[PDB]
Design a protein around this nucleic acid. Structure first.
Ligand SMILES: [Mn+2]
Ligand SMILES: [Mn+2]
Ligand SMILES: [Mn+2]
Ligand SMILES: [Mn+2]
Ligand SMILES: [Mn+2]
Ligand code: NA
Length: 347
DNA sequence: CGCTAGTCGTCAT
DNA sequence: ACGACTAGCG
């Protein structure tokens, strides 16, 4: 996520209703609904007691989409990405602490604090996601487990023309080059839509409304793949990209101190990290549902060697990627947990 | 003031 | 999976 991006480009946002896409196709960042839904039954998930409330929670939204004539495609997060594994280690750690503290509060008799700790120690397994998958399947609603981050998969579905809008709470989708994104959608269908073409409504952006520059800005501000330099957020990044139409981005980043009129030490490692982050936003492996095969989010340019892009996702055999996408193969154990076959969104 | 860096909140009775 | 909010920084 790009911290403070939505408020930064607020002027490009538009209050809408899902009817806007009546009869069209919309992909969903389902893990948001999964988190928000799992919060409702946090204590049960923490205790280990069986639950299925989040299933219904998601199904409210799914059914609401179906009633308005929308064709939803529930997309799920798959394998851990190396570029993001750092953050995966931190969040997983936090949960652990909150799982202890909470239990520690159950022994001390404190119940409110214990619930406030349980509500911040929730981890969405593939088992839960697969529950949601079966539930949605039993409705004719297609599902698709991304090779890695759902962000990239959604971005692909949107750019390929397979879907017209993306329902999510995450702003990263904009940096991945999505066309239309629907944020903060409630159970009734009311949300904020941000169109890529309307980025020019934001005065603050200036000439930074092109996909490449926008991406560079999002990375420079501080993203999941790379923490920003000290004292740098969206404003300064946007300012840098504004004042500099260089446009070799490396030289600009090396002259960030010059463009911002402030002393900034830029390590050689941060440049390589920036390249890695950029390449991750560009070429993260996704799954083509039609051709049924692993592909990067964008076609490999001439100025990049795919061999050096392991952090952006490792390739596996197309059959395995298919089995993961269908939700048949579990993410962690790599174990066949279901047998679904659509032959007996695709083709 | 503008801006960035951390601590809290998402559910739902 | 994330964002909103704000105290305190320059
Ligand atoms: Mn509750
Ligand atoms: Mn994999
Ligand atoms: Mn995960
Ligand atoms: Mn995501
Ligand atoms: Mn993201
Ligand atoms: Na930052």
């Amino acid at each position: 996520g790009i911290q403070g991006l939505l408020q930064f480009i607020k002027e490009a946002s538009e209050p809408i209703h899902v009817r806007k896409y009546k009869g069209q196709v919309v992909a969903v960042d389902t893990y948001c609904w999964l988190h928000k839904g799992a919060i409702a039954c946090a204590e049960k998930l923490a205790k280990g007691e069986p639950t299925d409330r989040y299933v219904g929670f998601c199904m409210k939204f799914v059914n609401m989409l179906l009633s308005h004539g929308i064709k939803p495609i529930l997309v799920f997060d798959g394998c851990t990405l190396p570029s993001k594994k750092e953050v995966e280690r931190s969040r997983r750690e936090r949960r652990q602490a909150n799982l202890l503290k909470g239990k520690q509060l159950l022994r001390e008799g404190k119940v409110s604090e214990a619930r406030e700790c349980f509500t911040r120690s929730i981890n969405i397994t593939h088992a839960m996601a697969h529950k949601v998958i079966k539930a949605a399947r039993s409705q004719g609603v297609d599902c698709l487990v991304a090779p890695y981050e759902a962000d990239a998969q959604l971005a692909y579905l949107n750019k390929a023309g397979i879907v017209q809008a993306i329902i999510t709470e995450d702003s990263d989708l904009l940096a991945f080059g999505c066309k239309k994104v629907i944020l903060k959608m409630d159970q009734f269908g009311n949300g904020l839509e941000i169109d890529q073409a309307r980025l020019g409504m934001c005065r603050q952006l200036g000439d930074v409304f092109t996909e490449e520059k926008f991406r560079y800005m999002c990375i420079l501000s501080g993203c999941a793949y790379l923490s920003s330099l000290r004292g740098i957020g969206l404003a300064k990044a946007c300012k840098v990209l504004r004042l500099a139409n260089n446009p070799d981005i490396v030289k600009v980043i090396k002259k960030i101190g010059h463009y911002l009129k402030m002393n900034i030490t830029v390590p050689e490692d941060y440049i390589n990290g920036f390249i890695r982050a950029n390449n991750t936003f560009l070429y993260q492996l996704v799954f083509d549902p039609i051709k049924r095969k692993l592909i990067p989010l964008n076609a490999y340019e001439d100025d990049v060697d795919p061999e050096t892009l392991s952090y952006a996702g490792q390739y596996v055999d197309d059959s395995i990627a298919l089995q993961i996408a269908l939700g048949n193969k579990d993410i962690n154990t790599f174990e066949q947990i279901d047998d679904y076959n659509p032959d007996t969104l695709y083709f």
